[PDB]
Amino acid sequence: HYPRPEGCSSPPNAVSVGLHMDLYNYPYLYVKGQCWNPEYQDPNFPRYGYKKYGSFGSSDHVNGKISWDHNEFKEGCKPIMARLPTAYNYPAKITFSNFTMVLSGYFKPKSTGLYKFEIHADDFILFNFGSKNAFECCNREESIDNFGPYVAYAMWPNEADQELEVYLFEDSYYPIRLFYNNRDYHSKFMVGFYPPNTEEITYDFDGYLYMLDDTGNEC
Numbered sequence: 187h188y189p190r191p192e193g194c195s196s197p198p199n200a201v202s203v204g205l206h207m208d209l210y211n212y213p214y215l216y217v218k219g220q221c222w223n224p225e226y227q228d229p230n231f232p233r234y235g236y237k238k239y240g241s242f243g244s245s246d247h248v249n250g251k252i253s254w255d256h257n258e259f260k261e262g263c264k265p266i267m268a269r270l271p272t273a274y275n276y277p278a279k280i281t282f283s284n285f286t287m288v289l290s291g292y293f294k295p296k297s298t299g300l301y302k303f304e305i306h307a308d309d310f311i312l313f314n315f316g317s318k319n320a321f322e323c324c325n326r327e328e329s330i331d332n333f334g335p336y337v338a339y340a341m342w343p344n345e346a347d348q349e350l351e352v353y354l355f356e357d358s359y360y361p362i363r364l365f366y367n368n369r370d371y372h373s374k375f376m377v378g379f380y381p382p383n384t385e386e387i388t389y390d391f392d393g394y395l396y397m398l399d400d401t402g403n404e405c
């Protein structure tokens with residue numbers, strides 16, 4: 187039985203394009219008995235530990251080509267400044283070597299059918315999906331950390347590749363929450379999907395990602 191998660195409904199004027207992003211500090215234990223912080227492994231971390239170093243940035247309308255694979259860095263145990271893809275509407279360089287990111291909003295299928303998602307993580311990616319898994323319809327800011335058991339849990343090195351299948355409907359916006367951490371050095375945040383009856387994967391979310399107003403009525 188393919189999973190069939192709950193979605194949301196909204197009048198078009200209450201809909202805007204793209205996801206919300208918040209960026210959080212994630213320090214090294216030390217910079218110039220390993221150097222990187224193992225905190226990200228604690229089970230309380232994705233629920234509330236991820237905020238305890240404070241945040242440093244946010245953006246909105248995050249759309250299109252949101253994945254990356256940064257494997258060019260030469261040095262470990264050291265903060266390295268680099269830019270996010272332009273999909274993030276976030277101009278400043280970040281400590282790509284060590285940071286945490288949460289992306290939330292809604293995935294809207296273009297056709298009713300079965301979707302397969304594929305994620306590849308360095309270091310850590312969590313995938314929550316559905317009004318009863320990610321967050322409440324039209325109440326994203328209040329319920330953002332009330333997510334359920336993960337639909338996918340990818341951690342480098344040993345659990346770094348994951349996939350999942352969900353059956354989805356044209357007329358519904360599905361709450362979606364993507365948690366990413368880099369503890370150190372190289373950074374990979376790859377979230378792709380296969381639409382229904384489609385053999386080739388895509389990493390372009392353009393036309394699929396939306397935000398609804400936080401009215402709180404289930405819309």
Ligand SMILES: CC(=O)N[C@@H]1[C@@H](O)[C@H](O[C@@H]2O[C@H](CO)[C@H](O)[C@H](O)[C@H]2O)[C@@H](CO)O[C@H]1O
Nearest residue numbers: 221222262263308309342369370371372373
């Ligand atoms: C070339 C090499 O082996 N460099 C090592 C790093 O692998 C290692 O850091 C880890 O790198 C992996 C990717 O392979 C991953 O991104 C981890 O997050 C990261 O900690 C590092 C140990 O601190 O030493 C480098 O020299």
Ligand SMILES: [Ca+2]
Nearest residue numbers: 308370371372
């Ligand atoms: Ca890493």
Ligand SMILES: [Cl-]
Nearest residue numbers: 191192316318
């Ligand atoms: Cl659900």
